[PDB]
Swiss-Prot record:
Record GO cellular component, one term: cytoplasm
Main localisation: cytoplasm
Gene Ontology molecular function terms on file: 1-phosphatidylinositol-3-kinase activity; 1-phosphatidylinositol-4,5-bisphosphate 3-kinase activity; 1-phosphatidylinositol-4-phosphate 3-kinase activity; ATP binding; protein serine kinase activity; protein serine/threonine kinase activity
Subunit relationships: Heterodimer of a catalytic subunit PIK3CG and a PIK3R5 or PIK3R6 regulatory subunit. Interacts with GRK2 through the PIK helical domain. Interaction with GRK2 is required for targeting to agonist-occupied receptor. Interacts with PDE3B; regulates PDE3B activity and thereby cAMP levels in cells. Interacts with TPM2. Interacts with EPHA8; regulates integrin-mediated cell adhesion to substrate. Interacts with HRAS; the interaction is required for membrane recruitment and beta-gamma G protein dimer-dependent activation of the PI3K gamma complex PIK3CG:PIK3R6.
Name of the gene this protein is made from: PIK3CG
Catalysed reaction equations from the record: a 1,2-diacyl-sn-glycero-3-phospho-(1D-myo-inositol-4,5-bisphosphate) + ATP = a 1,2-diacyl-sn-glycero-3-phospho-(1D-myo-inositol-3,4,5-trisphosphate) + ADP + H(+); a 1,2-diacyl-sn-glycero-3-phospho-(1D-myo-inositol) + ATP = a 1,2-diacyl-sn-glycero-3-phospho-(1D-myo-inositol-3-phosphate) + ADP + H(+); a 1,2-diacyl-sn-glycero-3-phospho-(1D-myo-inositol 4-phosphate) + ATP = a 1,2-diacyl-sn-glycero-3-phospho-(1D-myo-inositol-3,4-bisphosphate) + ADP + H(+); L-seryl-[protein] + ATP = O-phospho-L-seryl-[protein] + ADP + H(+)
EC number, UniProt record: 2.7.1.137, 2.7.1.153, 2.7.1.154, 2.7.11.1
Annotated positions binding ATP: 590-599, 625-633, 722-729
SUPFAM superfamilies in the cross-refs: ARM repeat, C2 domain (Calcium/lipid-binding domain, CaLB), Protein kinase-like (PK-like), Ubiquitin-like
Protein name: Phosphatidylinositol 4,5-bisphosphate 3-kinase catalytic subunit gamma isoform
Domain of life per record: Eukaryota
Domain C2 PI3K-type intervals: 167-300
Region ranges (G-loop): 564-570
């Protein structure tokens, strides 16, 4: 262990945000065991990735050009502007030419082929054997009807990515006692210990102890013998110890360790306090010992060795045809299991079929593995993310069952992996062991692609920072990725963390000045610009990669424009210059650092929104949403992308009117027209509004976050509406379709209109579009509530989304159901908003 070896670890831990070597909080060696087992897969991806292609991380898609983009193109032709210093030429190529057939054709028109096409002002290269039309930037430019400016520069040297040198007896447990240093005020409490043998979130068995008075020390020394036999215990089963006073304390212990051994010996586990969700499933113990409740137990080297009639048929398919949230009956399960090989021929049955398994029985499980052995039908089925996601949630704990889900994920191309990365990263919380297929799949895909890796870094880091329940597991996975991404990325991450940390302190040190009375003092803005000065001196990184948009390189601070927002939680409105000189503009980079809101929620919501945009893509729809970047940098803090030329709808009302609820109906249209002097840009901004508005209307409704204050919705000087603050979230409305909105669509009273009719038809089209992916949205929504909501979610919560999508209904009934929702908004006018103004603004 040279000084060099130690040094490396130190910085790694620094980047990680946690010390992955720490052992102060572990009752075994699973963590260390995983750090070692990931070394092979890590290296196995590193050496197998093309140095060049991994250096320029091309971003492409093998999906067909949507219909709304087909139009943007005229006769299989595209024009690209190539620049060389102040010399730039425009060329017209075929939408099927490769970036090489472009450079070659560029040397013809105007050592030798030692150059490459990069996007002006961005680290995004158009390279590889792929049609130019299959590059995201290209398709992005088309949609925005913008020009494609590329710069001819030198290809990065792959050397910069260099990687450093490398029993029939019934099971029984003994509860000795619980110890807690201090206790609650209401002190005439009573408590007992509930021991459960869980698996897949369902209890196979349960035992309890005699209730006793709640004291700083409670002994029992009672033997608890369950009914299930030691031989029946399935690998992945959990011994969930809980304390009731109402549940208050809980801790879990894997009965079968990572080595297939039966857990034994004396244990003193430090439990978690309850304030259902992902956290109640963790194997991790509470690190804080001096304050947490502790359970002392005892355990008894046993090793776990590695046709049908028409109405019956028609009743089987009826169950299989059921949605995800519909439970199963005793008969339901018995029917699914009896006909395993028949329910096996249909992939959409797997979830249902594998929950009908009696895992608490060695025999049944063994048969299951046999059943699974023959997976031709599955292996050859078409990838279905929604179906695959269902096998990765809290309902399954069998290593083999989950493994086949991951198996199908292997088919996803980088572009799609990017859409579901966040969700899949959260799914790790559902794994019973630190080392898993899903865990290795992510590690692998991160080392195989810089964009996937960049986000995998922050995604994991957000959880490492504010989740003591899973920071140990994630930290091991992050390290594994940091030990194989390269020295270049290892450097960017450093610059980014540095910039972040420094700005974090400031953001918080500024908020400390007035937290109950909005009033951005003149002196505060004076001190703010001062603290940044001290940093920009030479201590702050000259530049850094923007965490939510890695293709962008931020430079120096434009202290002049920086300020503290006139917001309650007083966030920071920072602006940077683009560190890239080849950029074709002078616009700054607006970044918002905020403390107070749980950005993990926004981050998750924003992601579903991106999932909905692509979903509409499959149907050739463009709702003009604006899922601005947002990354939870750490505990209660993170950044927010600033959308240029945009304001709050409320602000729009306040200017005309003021700090009153006497909302007008033309103010908005008067604000947009004023902004769009160029006529051709009004009707354009108007159609935009109709779509963006409709877009958010549909999406927001389905997610059950439509009733919202006028201050959390924004509009751009280009007519783009987009909801913002997704923080936590009598009269009520399905979504926001206020009079000022319907007005811009040329509709004063309850009278229809051309644009309003356009609006409606779009809403329906988008609404029906999502319904085709009901199952996908149902599972994502559920995982989100389980891993993204501080409180404990329930079935009721999940089922909402189901109703919103009107599952079971026909397209017609559906189409209508949404048109009625649109009506409520018309019959509610400014009612709701006025209430929000009265509630939020007045405190009533
Ligand atoms: O407090 C917030 C805020 O002010 C803005 C904002 C975004 C823009 O794009 C602007 O142009 C602007 O003026 C403000 O976004 C947010 C987005 C969130 O997810 C959460 C937030 O709390 C805010």
């Amino acid at each position: 262990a040279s000084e060099e070896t130690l040094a490396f670890q130190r910085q790694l831990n620094a980047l990680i945000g946690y010390d992955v070597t720490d052992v102060s909080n572990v009752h075994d060696d699973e963590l260390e065991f995983t750090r070692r087992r990931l070394v092979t897969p890590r290296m196995a991806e590193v050496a197998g990735r093309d140095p060049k292609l991994y250096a320029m991380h091309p971003w492409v898609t093998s999906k067909p050009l949507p219909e709304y983009l087909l139009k943007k193109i005229t006769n299989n032709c595209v024009f690209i502007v190539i620049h060389r210093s102040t010399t730039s030429q425009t060329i017209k190529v075929s939408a099927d030419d490769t970036p090489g057939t472009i450079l070659q054709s560029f040397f013809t028109k105007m050592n030798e082929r030692d150059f490459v096409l990069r996007v002006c002002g961005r680290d995004e290269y158009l390279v590889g054997e792929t049609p130019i039309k299959n590059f995201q930037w290209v398709r992005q430019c088309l949609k925005n009807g913008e020009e494609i400016h590329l710069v001819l520069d030198t290809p990065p040297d792959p050397a910069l990515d260099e990687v450093r040198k490398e029993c029939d007896r019934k099971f029984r447990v003994k509860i000795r006692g619980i110890d807690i240093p201090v206790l609650p005020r209401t002190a005439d409490l009573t408590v007992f210990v509930e021991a459960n043998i869980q698996y897949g979130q369902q209890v196979l068995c349960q035992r309890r102890t005699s209730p006793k008075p709640f004291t700083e020390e409670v002994l029992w020394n009672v033997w608890l013998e369950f009914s299930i036999k030691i031989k029946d215990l399935p690998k992945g089963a959990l011994l969930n110890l809980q304390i009731y006073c109402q549940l208050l304390y809980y801790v879990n212990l894997l009965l079968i360790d990572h080595r297939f051994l039966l857990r034994h010996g004396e244990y003193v586990l430090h439990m978690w306090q309850l304030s259902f969700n992902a956290d109640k499933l963790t194997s991790a113990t509470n690190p804080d010992k001096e304050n947490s409740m502790s359970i002392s137990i005892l355990l008894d080297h046993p090793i776990a060795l590695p046709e049908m009639p028409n109405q019956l048929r028609k009743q089987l398919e009826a169950i299989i045809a059921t949605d995800p949230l519909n439970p199963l009956t005793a008969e339901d399960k018995e029917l699914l299991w009896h006909f395993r090989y028949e329910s096996l021929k249909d992939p959409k049955a797997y979830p249902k079929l594998f929950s009908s398994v009696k895992w608490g029985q060695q025999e049944i499980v063994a048969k299951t593995y046999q059943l699974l052995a023959k997976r031709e039908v599955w292996d050859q089925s078409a990838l279905d993310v929604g179906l695959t996601m269902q096998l990765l949630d809290c309902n399954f704990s069998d290593e083999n069952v989950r493994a086949i889900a991951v198996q199908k994920l292997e088919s996803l191309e980088d572009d799609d992996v990017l859409h579901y990365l966040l969700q899949l990263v959260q799914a790790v919380k559902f794994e019973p062991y630190h080392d898993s297929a899903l865990a290795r799949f992510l590690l692998k895909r991160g080392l195989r692609n810089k964009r996937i890796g960049h986000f995998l870094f922050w995604f994991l880091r957000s959880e490492i920072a504010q989740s003591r329940h899973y920071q140990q597991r994630f930290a091991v996975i992050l390290e594994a990725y940091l030990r194989g991404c390269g020295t270049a990325m290892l450097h960017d991450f450093t610059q980014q963390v540095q910039v972040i940390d420094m700005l974090q302190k400031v953001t918080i040190d500024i908020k400390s000045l007035s937290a109950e009375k909005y009033d951005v003092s003149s002196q505060v803005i004076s001190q703010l610009k001062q603290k940044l000065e001290n940093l920009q001196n030479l201590n702050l990184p000259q530049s850094f990669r923007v965490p939510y948009d890695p293709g962008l390189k931020a430079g120096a601070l434009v202290i002049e424009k920086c300020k503290v927002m006139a917001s309650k939680k007083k966030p920071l409105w920072l602006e940077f210059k683009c560190a890239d000189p080849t950029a074709l503009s002078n616009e700054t980079i607006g970044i918002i650092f905020k403390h107070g809101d749980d950005l993990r929620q926004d981050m998750l919501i924003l992601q579903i929104l991106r999932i909905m945009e692509s979903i509409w893509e499959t149907e050739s729809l463009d709702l003009c949403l604006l899922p601005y970047g947002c990354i939870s940098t750490g505990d209660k803090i993170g950044m927010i992308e600033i959308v240029k030329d945009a304001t709050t709808i409320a602000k729009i009302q306040q200017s005309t009117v003021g700090n009153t609820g006497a909302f007008k109906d033309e103010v908005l249209s008067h604000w947009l027209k004023e902004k769009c002097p160029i006529e051709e840009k009004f009707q354009a901004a108007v159609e935009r509004f109709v779509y963006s508005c409709a877009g958010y209307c549909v999406a927001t409704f389905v997610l059950g976050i439509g009733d919202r204050h006028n201050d959390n919705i924004m509009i751009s000087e280009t007519g783009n509406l987009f909801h913002i603050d997704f923080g936590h979230i009598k009269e009520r409305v399905p979504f926001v379709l206020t009079p000022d909105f319907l007005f811009v669509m040329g509709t004063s009273g309850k009278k229809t209109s051309l644009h309003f009719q356009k609006f409606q038809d779009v809403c329906v089209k988008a609404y029906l579009a999502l319904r085709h992916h009901t199952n996908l949205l149902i599972i994502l929504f559920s995982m989100m509530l389980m891993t993204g909501m501080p409180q404990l979610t329930s079935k009721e919560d999940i089922e909402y989304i189901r109703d919103a999508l009107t599952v079971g209904k026909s397209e017609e009934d559906a189409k209508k159901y949404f048109l009625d929702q649109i009506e409520v908004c018309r019959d509610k006018g400014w009612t709701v908003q006025f209430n929000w103004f009265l509630h939020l603004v007045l405190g009533i």
